[PDB]
């Protein structure tokens, strides 16, 4: 029942700077055999995890030497001396001193870039979907940084809740931005009852919240 | 080279059962402990089970005790996980792993997806997200495809049979209350190419043998 | 109606078969005990001498069956002697934690072995002994008790070896269940202590009696016949007269 507490949850860091990730244990990881089974892994987006450091400070064979680990007892640290683009991903600590083997919650390492305001686009429902009895209105926030952003739907200036869902991409490996989709789904009958469909986007790269809208019967 | 290859994933009804295998090569399998780790979608890693080289010592995470069995066949270089009384919370990518000399996870397989759900397999409806003035920024237009209500998860999206990759964003699926998934794929292209370049999103859903090719055109 | 010395006469051949098969030191101690029975003036003397040879002979056959060295009681290591020699870096702490239970230091099991680190005997594998005990218990329904020290909830490891002890209690008495229950109760406290010292120990206890089918004992069947034809009959003839 060892609990591993990672900090920070997310770490933005500029290319070439150092990163330092902490892992605290709820009890000591010193085994009676004298070894300390605290290990560090990196999971790149869409790949399986990879071992980096085993037993506190042993770099796994072939792992770049910008990675190192230190600590003892209940306090441990993974350092990346000089962050590279390929280091984007989620870092986990894990212990195998006690059963059950347990993981930290993960630290998301984020590549710092300059602020990028989202381009905001809106797509009315297609005619095919409309013929099927449903209407999905999609709002797209393209290529923005940092990730924090608020997206809300207003139909005839009435705020919507319970009928929209959003999804965010991983941080792009080439340009380090995020993209975000928000999909408003209405019944056909409810859709054909209103005129203006508006996506309202707040982001620190914008001088003020942006409302992107269309009128139903307009082309 | 050390390699671990899982198989046996797929779709299981709640309460059902499934046996995963992991084939190991490139090291003397029978001298080393082996492990299963899992990761639920968009969540962190979760250790599942350990088995010593000679099968003498077996450990289990408490969330699978009395339901999962770990075993191995040393002459066949094969690790097993027998899953029973499966629940929706067991939906995860399942990895087999080994320390090749210790209890850490030095080598990992590519993983195999187990989806525990009573939803029935279903190909997606694919709808165009047509470029318009509401999706144009300067000399750039955005367009895309809404890939709605499919099951189970694995769906692949490409554009123009993969020739178009620059500016493509395919969003992670969302599990809907209905028990199905939906996602969209978008791409920004030069507004000058609308009317001259054809844009087709290619949607492949292998669990249902559904392949869809949807032409996205400017709406008139 | 038979004199005790005459009882030993009738079982000359059974007891000569027994003495020839036991380990040397075991055979000698049993032989002396047998002459004590032959020259026993009282009925309590004979019975008490017969009981010792029941225990000593069976233990000799336990050593033969398992290819372990038979150890006379006088040469048997205590627990403290084992901690002193196998875990010398932890002996001082072993003493401090046994202040309130000093009799722990003097517990003397039938077999006190350690894993070959290459008077505590050494064995090739502790887990192999534990597994073969667990197998016969699972296969033939033979009651055992079995306890392994474990600091906190530690996992075993594959990257380093540690020294370890196997503590084994055996016996030949009617109440098989009661023997293993009391044995593991005696040793539980020291298992718990061992856990706090980071010392790996396994404790095994088992028992046979004369009603255990001859194929099912903890000793080879051939040894079962030698005991039943000698020491067991002697107990029957002592009663009748
Ligand atoms: O009966 C057994 O199973 C014993 O192992 C007994 C034992 O240790 C002992 C020690 C000293 C005197 C008499 C019996
Ligand atoms: Mn004894
Ligand atoms: Mn005994």
From TrEMBL, chain C:
Annotated region (Disordered), positions in chain: 137-156
Basic and acidic residues composition-biased segments: 137-155
Top-level taxonomic group: Viruses
Name of the protein this chain belongs to: RNA-directed RNA polymerase L
Species for this entry: Kasokero virus
Coverage span on the entire protein: 610 to 903 of 3972
